[PDB]
């Protein structure tokens, strides 16, 4: 018997990696389909993106089940820790099994394997629940303290084999941190992994000028800089939001999951945007994709905050309630990215020929706006105080 907080943190660290495993193929795709190979490369990329989204949602469902499981339970020991490790091992196969099933939907073997993996996860979770209930001290204080323990003996056991449901705020934060950390550094792993100039390559195709090779690699560095900045600032908005949240309802969990699923695409968006256009006309499409992905990433954080405001009395700290001290600041912080991305996207059509410039200007303005947001909001409130 001991505190289970750390093993849950490790479980979230594993679940973030497993959920975001499937973006690696997407970012390793053929970014430059020269000779107009788009006709097939884009179909392949769409298949990979669909697989990534589906696997992320499935693994997030598994994580939700896991957090509820270790929310009826409230303690740990060697046996529970090892059972949780086994459950985590059985969850890591969901991405591969689902990808195999999607690749071979006709062959029954893929679906059989996916069903076997799901049944295994359920079996290990049922084992965890049974072990926890056989030793009553391991349950959460309420479950063991309550004389209604007999019905709880069946409730979640049946569940393993709704928008007001309180999720674990700490575990939502941990999973979000893991996903943001993975996504922000997603495409520096690529640069470190394969983008170190080989001595022979610089000698032959650059005449021995290392700076020429570094310049050739430059675009990937620009992509990484933009992607890290965007994802880190989205995480900053997320962190500011959850600092003022007292409870996380399942609606907030769903909106957070959508936000993370759409955040996962930012590395691809910036990687495409830095692969400068052979025909500048499609740079408009690249910028549109980047802006729409950023908006989808951030608008769901804003939607989560508003869904929380719907019950702020019980869900949000007083500092952020309607008319609170930091309500206006919170709204500005959460809506800074949606508004900027939407304005840039509109510029892609109404002011198309300057769209790349406006997008690169937004990438520089939004960080400064976040840095100066307190002062800007103070100025805005002073202006709309006499006027």
């Amino acid at each position: 018997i001991q505190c289970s907080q750390r093993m849950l943190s490790f479980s979230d660290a594993l679940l973030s990696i497993i959920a975001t495993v499937m973006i690696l193929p997407v970012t390793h795709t053929e970014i430059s389909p020269e000779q107009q190979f788009d006709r097939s490369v884009q179909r392949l990329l769409a298949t990979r993106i669909a697989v990534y989204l589906m696997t992320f949602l499935i693994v997030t469902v598994a994580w939700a089940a896991h957090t509820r499981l270790f929310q009826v339970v409230g303690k740990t020991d060697d046996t529970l820790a090892l059972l949780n490790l086994a459950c985590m091992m059985t969850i890591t196969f969901l991405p591969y099994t689902f990808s195999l099933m999607v690749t071979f939907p006709d062959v029954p073997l893929g679906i059989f394997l996916f069903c076997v993996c799901v049944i295994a996860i359920g079996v290990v979770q049922a084992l965890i629940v049974g072990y926890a209930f056989h030793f009553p001290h391991l349950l959460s204080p309420q479950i063991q303290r309550s004389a209604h323990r007999a019905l709880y003996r069946r409730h979640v056991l049946g569940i393993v084999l709704d928008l007001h449901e309180p999720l674990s705020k700490e575990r939502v934060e941990a999973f979000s941190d893991g996903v943001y950390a993975i996504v922000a550094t997603l495409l520096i792993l690529d640069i470190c992994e394969d983008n170190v100039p080989d001595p022979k390559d610089v000698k032959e195709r650059f005449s021995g000028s290392l700076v020429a090779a570094l310049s050739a690699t430059g675009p990937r560095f620009l992509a990484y800089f933009g992607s890290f900045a965007t994802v880190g600032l989205l995480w900053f908005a997320h962190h500011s939001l959850f600092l003022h949240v007292r409870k996380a309802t399942r609606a907030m969990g769903l909106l957070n999951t959508l936000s993370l699923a759409f955040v996962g695409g930012l590395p691809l968006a910036y990687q495409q945007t830095s692969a400068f256009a052979r025909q500048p006309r499609d740079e408009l499409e690249r910028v549109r994709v980047s802006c729409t992905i950023i908006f989808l990433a951030s608008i769901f954080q804003l939607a989560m905050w508003t869904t929380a405001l719907l019950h702020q009395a019980e869900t949000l700290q007083p500092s952020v309630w309607f008319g609170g001290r930091e309500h206006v600041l919170m709204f500005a912080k959460l809506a800074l990215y949606p508004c900027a991305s939407l304005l840039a996207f509109a510029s892609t059509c109404l002011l198309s020929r300057f769209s790349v410039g406006i997008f690169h200007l937004m990438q520089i303005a939004v960080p400064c706006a976040f840095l100066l947001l307190r002062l800007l909001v103070g100025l805005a409130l002073a202006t709309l105080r006499v006027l």
Binding site: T292, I299, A303, T306, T307, L310, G323, P338, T348, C349
Partner: peptide, 28 residues
Amino acid sequence: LIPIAVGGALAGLVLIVLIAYLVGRKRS
């Protein structure tokens, strides 16, 4: 065409978010 379509979809998303904001405001 499609750029304006998805722009309208995004405008609808922000509109529904604002509607939720105002519903919360009145519920306050």
